[PDB]
């Protein structure tokens, strides 16, 4: 703590993207599983980059997933899946491991909707009940089998996602709603009513942009835009 | 044809089957001619997938308006990004094609949005605000807030614009009110006895937002919603929810409430406009509103 | 009250005369149900002196009885440079708002103003032109008039 706050956030969870850097260190477990870091600590320049090519023109034969550079959200939904974690196990040297992330992905998708949800208290409570042992059994096979890279490091999407959720979910409610995204999406719609209805000089032109994006929002006006 | 035929032609050749459809309307429905055959006709149509002329026929008789509420007119103005010039060459056509007003002109349409904007709802506080004006009907405040144009100083060019939070906050609520009062009706709770315990759950929020693209590049939008209205009447009752917002991420219902031309980054200039909105937020939490909805007065916490 | 009935229940009650009116256009109009109903209501109306009624009604059938001429609809969608789906949306309200089909739907506009357009109308040509095609229904021609795209050439 060095600056003097002025604005109380609930220090909430934000349930829009929540997930990518769990997708990409995924990611960078499978290449590291074609790959040897427990047999070889020390990869060098190109390594990596070899195993990253194998692993996706592997998963372009299987899942016909071409590849990218940012896990955006369709992308990340197909790559956290039973079916890819077999696919990618089938190059893993090794069968041991191949059943140790299996189950690991398998434990992912028992928890990982209970975060995006809008109210598991009755969407699907029994994974909020199972969550706590779900996310001991996540962290305990993380530790015994992958501690090559979390020894010191953790990205913090992966902390809050493992320590805090069900509490959060206790104390508020949900996660999802409070996502920011809405707002965000709002966004298409100022600099667009920007360029129709303009003033236009800038003394004026935000009184009528607020107008029209307030009267936009209402309930009453949508009230008559029923279309059943 | 019968049709080509005058009207003398058509009652000769057709008085049988209207005595026939007068003793049987005699018979079965109190000799109601009218009726009868309006029926008839209404399924005569329906039998040749003629949807069309039937709904116009009975948008003929109960109801026949011909006349559009100024509220959808003004909500289809604005909804469908319609601009305004625009909107009146369309009027002056859609009146001059057809004999009837159906698109209500553009100064009442105005006057007739002019009462949902904020600052038309009275109010009052219990107490009175922490250090604000007690007055209710200012609309649309200059976001610079009272900001000396001495040179000398800090530049006063910042632009923004914004309401007062609790002015757009009461306006939310009366807007709100037909879906409180149905809640009302379903949890079928009684009415002189839900006047005190309302609790309003709002979600806050402000991103930044970059390049306004064109031939003025940066941008907030500090904005909210009301998310959840619940009932504290009159044991613990721990919670009862009188309606939980249904998209509170569906952008149809993120109401801005604050807009600056500024950066995301510097401190400076966001918490130099941001202020008033703070102080506002805190020295609310407290105190109790009275809004007249339904009729009767009730109170609010937040 | 007959009126306030579905139309299985309004169906149900009036069978009976339906099947009257139905042999009786049978017997002297040759089954035109729609036109004897239509007379009756005319004259029912004429009638009960509301005269304004019957006056529309008239219009309704044989007149542009669907509420606006689709070509002024047309026209007010170009006239204002108003978008397409803009057009559906608006559409949607005005009905679902009042009761009546006052707009013209989409794919019935197009169709009708697909007549307004060059390459619609047969006509002929006395001589027939020098070097000209004998098509008339041919519409938005390519202007590139036909060029060998090989890249050998100018473009
Ligand atoms: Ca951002
Ligand atoms: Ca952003």
Aim: aromatic share 8%.
């Amino acid at each position: 703590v060095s600056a003097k706050p002025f604005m109380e956030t609930q220090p909430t969870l934000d349930a829009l993207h929540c997930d990518i850097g769990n997708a990409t260190e995924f990611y960078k477990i499978f290449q590291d599983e074609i790959g040897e870091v427990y047999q070889k600590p020390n990869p060098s320049r190109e390594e990596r980059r070899r195993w990253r090519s194998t692993l996706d023109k592997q998963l372009r034969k299987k899942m016909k997933l071409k590849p990218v550079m940012r896990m955006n959200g369709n992308y990340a939904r197909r790559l956290m899946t039973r079916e890819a974690v077999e696919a990618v196990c089938e190059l893993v040297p090794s069968e041991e491991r191949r059943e140790a992330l299996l189950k690991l992905m398998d434990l992912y998708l028992q928890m990982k909707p209970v975060w995006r949800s809008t109210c598991p208290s009755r969407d699907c409570p029994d994974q909020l009940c199972q969550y706590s042992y779900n996310s001991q059994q996540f962290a305990d096979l993380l530790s015994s089998m992958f501690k090559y890279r979390y020894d010191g490091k953790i990205t913090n999407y992966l902390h809050k996602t493992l320590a805090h959720v069900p509490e959060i979910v206790e104390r508020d409610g949900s996660i999802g709603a409070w996502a920011s995204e809405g707002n965000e999406s709002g966004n298409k719609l100022f600099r667009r009513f920007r360029k129709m209805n303009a003033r236009q000089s800038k003394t004026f032109e935000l009184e009528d942009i607020l107008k029209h994006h307030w009267l936009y929002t209402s309930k009453y006006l949508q009230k008559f835009m029923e279309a059943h | 044809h019968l049709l080509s035929l005058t009207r003398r032609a058509q009652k000769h050749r057709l008085r049988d089957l209207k005595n026939q459809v007068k003793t049987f309307a005699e018979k079965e429905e109190g000799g109601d001619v009218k009726s009868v055959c309006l029926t008839l006709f209404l399924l005569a149509l329906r039998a040749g997938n003629e949807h069309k002329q039937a709904d116009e026929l009975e948008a003929m008789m109960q109801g026949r308006g011909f006349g559009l509420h100024p509220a959808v007119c003004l909500a289809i103005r604005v909804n469908t990004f319609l601009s305004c010039s625009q909107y009146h060459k369309m009027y002056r056509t859609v009146k001059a094609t057809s004999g009837r007003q159906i698109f209500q002109p553009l100064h009442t349409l105005r006057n007739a949005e002019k009462e949902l904007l904020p600052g038309f709802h009275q109010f009052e506080w219990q107490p009175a605000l922490k250090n604000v004006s007690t007055s209710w009907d200012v609309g649309i405040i200059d976001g610079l807030s009272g900001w000396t144009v001495s040179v000398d100083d800090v530049p006063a060019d910042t632009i923004s614009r914004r309401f007062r939070y609790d002015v757009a906050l009461v306006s939310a609520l009366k807007d709100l009110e037909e879906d409180i009062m149905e809640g009302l009706r379903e949890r079928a709770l009684d009415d002189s006895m839900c006047t005190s315990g309302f609790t309003v759950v709002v979600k806050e929020s402000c991103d930044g937002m970059g390049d306004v693209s064109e031939k003025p590049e940066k941008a907030v939008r500090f904005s909210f919603t009301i998310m959840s209205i619940s009932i504290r009447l009159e044991g613990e009752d721990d919670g009862i929810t009188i309606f939980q917002e249904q998209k509170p991420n569906s952008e149809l219902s993120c109401r801005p409430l604050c807009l600056m031309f500024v950066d995301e980054s510097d401190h400076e200039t966001l918490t130099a406009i941001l202020g008033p909105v703070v102080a506002e937020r805190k020295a609310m939490m407290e105190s109790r509103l009275i809004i007249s909805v339904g009729g009767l007065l009730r109170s609010f916490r937040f």
